[PDB]
Amino acid sequence: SMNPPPPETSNPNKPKRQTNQLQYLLRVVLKTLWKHQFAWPFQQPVDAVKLNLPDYYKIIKTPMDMGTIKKRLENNYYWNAQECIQDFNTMFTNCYIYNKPGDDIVLMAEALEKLFLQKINELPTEE
Ligand SMILES: Cc1nnc2n1-c1ccccc1C(c1ccccc1)=N[C@H]2NC(=O)OCc1ccccc1
């Protein structure tokens, strides 16, 4: 079994900025989710080899996780908030696509997503 390379967190010819919205996504959104009791399965890419999920990366073709998002935010990888918000939504969607309703991992994703939605509701206006 083999894992794919992780999503990129560095790319010098990708345009990027530091905006107040992106600062909020790190300081408030990422930090809130990262500290949650249910964050741990989402803190790094899915290790399909160790978890014995040989079909994971057949089904999930756009993987995303908070470890990647954290590095992207710390490395100022993004151009805008929308890009980062998309990464979070991809992470949650992947979980719901791969797993069954009521599964522990789905309940965990749902708890994190609720908080994500609460925080993103107060995304500040662009300065
Ligand atoms: C993130 C994410 N998205 N899906 C899955 N994780 C995940 C990522 C990383 C780690 C665990 C998980 C858990 C999980 C997490 C918490 C509780 C239940 C399940 N479940 C994984 N899914 C699955 O079928 O694992 C079977 C399995 C589960 C565990 C071991 C072997 C085989």
Curated annotation (Swiss-Prot):
There is a cross-link at residue 58 (Glycyl lysine isopeptide (Lys-Gly) (interchain with G-Cter in SUMO2)). Ubiquitously expressed. Residues 17-123 form the Bromo domain. The record marks 99 as: Acetylated histone binding. It is found in: Nucleus; Chromosome. Coiled coil: none annotated. Changing residue 99 to A: Abolishes binding to acetylated histones. Phosphorylation by CK2 disrupt the intramolecular binding between the bromo domain 2 and the NPS region and promotes binding between the NPS and the BID regions, leading to activate the protein and promote binding to acetylated histones. In absence of phosphorylation, BRD4 does not localize to p53/TP53 target gene promoters, phosphorylation promoting recruitment to p53/TP53 target promoters. It is linked to Cornelia de Lange syndrome 6: A form of Cornelia de Lange syndrome, a clinically heterogeneous developmental disorder associated with malformations affecting multiple systems. It is characterized by facial dysmorphisms, abnormal hands and feet, growth delay, cognitive retardation, hirsutism, gastroesophageal dysfunction and cardiac, ophthalmologic and genitourinary anomalies. CDLS6 inheritance is autosomal dominant. JQ1, a thieno-triazolo-1,4-diazepine derivative, and I-BET, a benzodiazepine derivative, have been tested on tumors with success. Treatment with GSK1210151A (I-BET151, a I-BET derivative) has strong effets on mixed lineage leukemia and promotes myeloid differentiation and leukemia stem-cell depletion. Belongs to the BET family. Interacts with p53/TP53; the interaction is direct. Interacts (via CTD region) with CDK9 and CCNT1, acting as an associated component of P-TEFb complex. Interacts with RELA (when acetylated at 'Lys-310'). Interacts (via NET domain) with NSD3, CHD4, BICRA and ATAD5. The interaction with BICRA bridges BRD4 to the GBAF complex. Interacts (via NET domain) with JMJD6 (via JmjC and N-terminal domains); the interaction is stronger in presence of ssRNA and recruits JMJD6 on distal enhancers. Interacts with NSD3. Interacts with NIPBL. The NET domain mediates interaction with a number of chromatin proteins involved in transcription regulation (NSD3, JMJD6, CHD4, GLTSCR1 and ATAD5). The C-terminal (CTD) region mediates interaction and recruitment of CDK9 and CCNT1 subunits of the P-TEFb complex. It is also required for maintenance of higher-order chromatin structure. Chromatin reader protein that recognizes and binds acetylated histones and plays a key role in transmission of epigenetic memory across cell divisions and transcription regulation. Remains associated with acetylated chromatin throughout the entire cell cycle and provides epigenetic memory for postmitotic G1 gene transcription by preserving acetylated chromatin status and maintaining high-order chromatin structure. During interphase, plays a key role in regulating the transcription of signal-inducible genes by associating with the P-TEFb complex and recruiting it to promoters. This is Bromodomain-containing protein 4. It comes from Homo sapiens. The gene is BRD4. The chain holds residues 44 to 168 of 1362 of the full protein.
